[PDB]
């Protein structure tokens, strides 16, 4: 009822039907990510868990690729090493210059993640510039600067499915996508503040602290 495969030479066995990223965690090969989570539903929005798969035309996300037997998983293909720098660079062209005012200074998952796999430069030097996002008042508990958000969906899937306050949501296409009620109404579920440990950037953070 279990499946053994190969990640970077490391043979590893895991229960069938599971996600590939858990197999990478079990094998000990660390794979970076932004929108996978254990206790949450799986969406491939982050594009970070790209990984090379034998019998695959293109590198695929390791979060939602299901475990199949006879699998050869490679993480250090030069195409994949290209791809991670690529996706990091794509993410870092609308995230604003807030690293000394953002709350998660050392705890920015994105940031430590962008030191291993980030580019040297960033060729944003466009004139008319990045997008920018409304303040988005929510409540007296959760500090909110939605400019730093990357729409990693990890807030809204949680408050949807497990916290059970479905007031959060994604509204708009492209860079007109926002997160939250566009009523500007107060969020409350009885575990409300659990999203600020969960948004991996400091878009949602702690208001008294």
């Amino acid at each position: 009822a279990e499946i053994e495969l190969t990640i970077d030479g490391h043979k590893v066995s895991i229960e069938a039907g599971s996600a590939l990223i858990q197999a990478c965690e079990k094998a000990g090969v660390t794979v970076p990510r932004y929108c996978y989570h254990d206790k949450l539903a799986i969406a491939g929005n982050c594009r970070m868990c790209l990984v090379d798969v034998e019998r695959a035309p293109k590198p695929v996300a390791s979060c939602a690729y299901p475990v199949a037997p006879g699998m050869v998983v490679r993480t250090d293909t030069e195409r994949v090493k290209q791809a991670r720098e690529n996706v990091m660079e794509m993410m870092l062209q609308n995230h604003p210059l807030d690293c000394p005012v953002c709350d998660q200074g050392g705890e920015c998952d994105l940031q430590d993640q962008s030191m291993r796999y980030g580019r040297d430069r960033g060729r944003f030097t466009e004139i008319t510039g990045k997008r920018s996002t409304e303040d988005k008042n929510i409540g007296p508990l959760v500090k909110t600067s939605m400019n730093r958000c990357i729409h990693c969906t990890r807030c809204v899937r949680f408050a949807n499915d497990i916290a059970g306050a479905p007031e959060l949501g994604s509204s708009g296409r492209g860079n007109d996508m926002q997160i939250g009620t566009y009523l500007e109404k107060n969020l409350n579920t009885e575990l409300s503040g659990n999203v600020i440990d969960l948004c991996p950037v400091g878009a949602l953070t702690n208001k008294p602290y």
Partner: protein, 181 residues
């Protein structure tokens, strides 16, 4: 002789006047000597707080580095391409003797070659046993040199020495220090 004595009008020093210069030429050990004061309207003008060259100054960079389109980082990476600390047991050198080398292997039968590997990889033989086992050509090929000589303690870039001795030397004879290079 390309760095010998030059006269004192090319030394950037406060100098003298002209009857006192005519005095001190007759009264000095060598005339070509600077009094040590730099020339005031030349040395440290304009001040480093006001330099017109400092107004336009963007960045020093090189062409394969600053090339935005062509390179990725991982081709020009240098921290993650470090060499590994090659460690060698006593046992793996016995592996290098009898099992051979990737230059010249001594092992066929790749199935049982693993078995011949693995007891030595578990400690089937000893090193001195392998030394008695190693042939004269084995010892003179992969332990000693082809003449059977011990290897010289090897150096990065051997620097042969000249000894400059004559008028290009920095001291004439009598002075005990020589100036080899």
């Amino acid at each position: 002789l390309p760095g010998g004595p030059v006269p004192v009008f090319k030394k950037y020093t406060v100098g003298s006047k002209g009857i006192w210069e005519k005095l001190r030429v007759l009264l000095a050990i060598a005339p070509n000597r600077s009094t040590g004061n730099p020339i005031v309207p030349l040395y440290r003008v304009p001040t480093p707080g006001s330099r017109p060259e400092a107004n336009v100054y963007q960045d020093p960079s090189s062409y394969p580095t600053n090339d935005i389109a062509e390179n990725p980082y991982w081709k020009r990476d240098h921290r993650r391409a470090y060499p590994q600390t090659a460690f060698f047991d006593q046992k793996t050198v016995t592996g290098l003797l009898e099992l051979g080398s990737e230059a010249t292997p001594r092992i066929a039968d790749g199935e049982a070659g693993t078995k011949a590997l693995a007891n030595i990889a578990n400690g089937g033989v000893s090193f001195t046993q392998a030394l008695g086992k190693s042939s004269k050509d084995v010892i003179y090929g992969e332990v000693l040199t082809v003449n059977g000589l011990p290897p010289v303690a090897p150096t990065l870039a051997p620097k042969q020495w000249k000894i400059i001795e004559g008028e290009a030397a920095i001291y004439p004879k009598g002075y005990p220090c020589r100036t080899f290079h």
